Write a protein that binds this ligand. Structure first.
Ligand SMILES: O=C(Cn1c(-c2cccs2)cc2ccccc21)NCc1ccccn1
Length: 300
């Protein structure tokens, strides 16, 4: 499905004993399975006992797909990709073990730290310019890594990023986005749900997905960040958003967004995929601004 790692045409899979996993409570549930918070014993040398997110898959094709999923997730090792620890194949259900990200999905985190909201890692009130850039740079670093391994995401959006302790941001999700954020998808035939608001015209019109369609989605992610998690084209219905995107309309500059950052967004939104800036360049630009001294960021 769109955004699933198995859509990539790209064993060393680590196994965990069922006894080493102790389920605490459910974190969520979707069409593909349930996600629990659990304690995992003897996983990391110093740890002894550590918190993890455990995806219990619903279930053949399912067992075959599971193995291909774990192989692909095992290939990923980067500071800005949600860590995959391994599987549990003893008994049912089959389990996938991941690191636990304390602050939840990036969309929820932006909204809870934005002007429309009701203090350990973040100051009171809306996130500052420097925090917004740090968040953007980290998502970009994750996208640089995936592009380097020739992976295509297809569902890049803040809902599909997680936030951990110390404001660490990583790309990853436990396959519940269509269930938690159903309004972020356009349902085509009772089953297929498309994240049209994050998609470029070649993906909507021609159903083509590449590193360049992901860079367009990154531009939309940049916009979500600088709007504090607001839905792109929120004022438009699903058909009206398809019309705007195909007609070549671009999202307005967010109020918290400096001109320099908006130029980075527009670079991701070139009609011709070939003309879009590389993620490597997008990352270098955002990282530079993120680590800029307060004197420089204050005038931006
Ligand atoms: O596989 C993913 C997302 N995903 C990840 C990760 C998921 C966790 C940690 S990293 C890496 C990756 C690399 C290329 C493309 C997608 C990728 N999500 C699960 C899903 C999506 C849709 C429907 C059902 N299940």
């Amino acid at each position: 499905l769109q955004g699933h790692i198995i859509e990539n045409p790209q064993a060393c899979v680590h196994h965990i004993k069922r006894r080493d996993i102790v389920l605490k409570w459910e974190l969520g549930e979707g069409a593909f399975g349930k996600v629990f918070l659990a304690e995992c014993h003897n996983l990391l040398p110093e740890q002894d006992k550590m918190l993890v997110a455990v995806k219990a898959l619903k279930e053949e094709s399912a067992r075959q797909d599971f193995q291909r999923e774990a192989e692909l997730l095992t290939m990923l090792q980067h500071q800005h990709i949600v860590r995959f620890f391994g599987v549990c194949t003893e008994g049912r259900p089959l389990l996938m073990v991941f690191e636990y990200m304390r602050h939840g999905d990036l969309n929820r985190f932006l909204r809870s730290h934005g002007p429309d909201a009701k203090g350990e890692d973040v100051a009171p009130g809306p996130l500052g310019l420097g925090q917004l850039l740090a968040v953007a740079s980290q998502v970009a670093a994750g996208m640089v890594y995936l592009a380097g391994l020739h992976f295509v995401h297809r569902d890049l959006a803040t809902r599909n990023c997680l936030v951990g302790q110390g404001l660490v941001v990583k790309i990853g999700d436990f396959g519940m986005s269509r269930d938690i954020y159903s309004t972020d998808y356009y349902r085509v035939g009772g089953r297929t749900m498309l994240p049209i608001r994050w998609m470029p015209p070649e993906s909507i019109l021609y159903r083509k997905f590449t590193t360049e369609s992901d860079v367009w989605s990154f531009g939309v992610v940049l916009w979500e960040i600088f709007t504090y998690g607001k839905q792109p084209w929120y004022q438009l219905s699903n058909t009206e958003a398809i019309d705007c995107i195909t007609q070549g309309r671009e999202l307005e500059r967010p109020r918290a967004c400096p001109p320099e950052v908006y130029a980075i967004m527009r670079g991701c939104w070139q009609r011709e995929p070939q003309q879009r800036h590389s993620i490597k360049d997008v990352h270098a630009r955002l990282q530079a601004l993120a680590q800029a001294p307060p004197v420089y960021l204050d005038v931006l």
